[PDB]
């Protein structure tokens, strides 16, 4: 799908390895990943389906691309889960948001989230959640999100 | 598998419909759910797999019910969903969801036992971490289960 000022958004592809690992670095440690592992990863992500006239993908890994040079400007994913509560409802989980360093401050982060949400709600999610740091509560509030709890973790 | 005092933990089954909907109401709105809807839901949960490489089979959904052996009634339920990422070397992240302890079994320490088991399930699969969201009232409880504060949960409905 097309977006303004010459960027567009589409699902991630096997050939995105270099650029995606590069923009994900902004988020954390990505490590060594071989083209083969990646293709298997991408084929899993392209075949994993959520039992539901809709085809529902569990993983929806997006990259926003600068059409100018076909360079990945940002990536984000939304994972779909089917629960029992809410009449066997769907809950979306936005994960791994990263705006590439040379593309910061151009509004792409908010466009990416908007798209992930759109994707989640079209599938029928009764809600979409994500976790963030306090310093980013404001930003997600601008994307229409609300404070809803606390994130707990165990490594 | 078998827990202390006559309780045991296993994967949810199609026959668990009435009791689990009942204990989940403790959490929130469960709604109308036909036995057929449930079996297909159950069939999905028992078929959905997380791509590995090799010889251990990873289930995306791990819907557990702690059962009172005395009367085969569900004392509690919890689930840990398994996600595969690109970060952390195509890492695995566990996400604990929908924890509920049945009303007639509150205060028996089942909640903590349930959490401990989900964590074990996730770590055996290889998760580099396991996360969940909760209310501030329950931060203390999750701190006792070995979790630590990690961020803020945002939602949009």
Swiss-Prot record, chain B:
Subunit note: Homodimer.
Keywords, ordered alphabetically: Acetylation, Acyltransferase, Transferase
Superkingdom to which the source organism belongs: Eukaryota
Protein name as it appears in the record: Glucosamine 6-phosphate N-acetyltransferase
GO MF term list: glucosamine 6-phosphate N-acetyltransferase activity
Residues that bear N-acetylserine: 2
Name of the coding gene: GNA1
Pathway: Nucleotide-sugar biosynthesis; UDP-N-acetyl-alpha-D-glucosamine biosynthesis; N-acetyl-alpha-D-glucosamine 1-phosphate from alpha-D-glucosamine 6-phosphate (route I): step 1/2
Gene3D superfamilies in UniProt: 3.40.630.30
One annotated GO biological process: UDP-N-acetylglucosamine biosynthetic process
Enzyme class (EC, first level): transferase
One GO location term (cellular component): cytoplasm
EC number(s) on file: 2.3.1.4
InterPro entries hit by this protein: Acyl_CoA_acyltransferase, GNAT_dom, GNPNAT1-like
Catalytic activity: D-glucosamine 6-phosphate + acetyl-CoA = N-acetyl-D-glucosamine 6-phosphate + CoA + H(+)
Entry binding sites for D-glucosamine 6-phosphate: 28, 85-88, 97-99, 128-129, 133, 157
Extra facts: Present with 2550 molecules/cell in log phase SD medium.
Family of the protein in this entry: Belongs to the acetyltransferase family. GNA1 subfamily.
